[PDB]
Amino acid sequence: SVQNNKFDEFGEWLLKESNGSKDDLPSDVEIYKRIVELEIADTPETLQVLGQVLFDDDIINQIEPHVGLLTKLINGDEEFEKALLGGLERFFGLEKPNLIPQIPKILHGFYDRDLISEEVLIKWGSKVSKKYVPKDVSKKVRKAAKPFVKWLQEAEEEEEEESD
HEC readout, the chain: CCCCCHHHHHHHHHHHHHCCCHHHCCCHHHHHHHHHHCCCCCCCHHHHHHHHHCCCCCHHHHCHHHHHHHHHHHCCCHHHHHHHHHHHHHHHHHHCHHHHHHHHHHHHHHHHCCCCCHHHHHHHHCCCCCCCCCHHHHHHHHHHHHHHHHHHHHHHHHHHHCCC
Q: What is the CA radius of gyration of the chain?
A: 16
Which pairs with CB-CB distance under 8 Å and at least 24 residues apart come from 4-7?
6/38, 6/39, 6/40, 7/40, 7/43, 7/45, 7/46, 7/48, 7/49
Whole-angstrom distance, CA of residue 109 vs CA of residue 6: 29
42-57 burial by CB neighbour count: b if 16+ within 10 A, else e? ebbbbbbbbbbbbbee
CB 127 within 8 A of CB 133: no
**Inter-CA distances, 128 with 21, 98, 100, Å:** 31, 20, 16
**Inter-CA distances, 28 with 25, 31, 68, Å:** 8, 5, 8
CB 22 within 8 A of CB 62: yes
Domains in the chain with CATH codes: 1-154 (1.25.40.180)
Whole-angstrom distance, CA of residue 12 vs CA of residue 33: 16
Closest of 145, 144, 98 to residue 120, by C-alpha: 145
Whole-angstrom distance, CA of residue 149 vs CA of residue 61: 21
CB 120 within 8 A of CB 160: no
Whole-angstrom distance, CA of residue 68 vs CA of residue 141: 26
Closest of 129, 122, 164 to residue 146, by C-alpha: 122
CB 30 within 8 A of CB 10: no
CB 54 within 8 A of CB 106: no
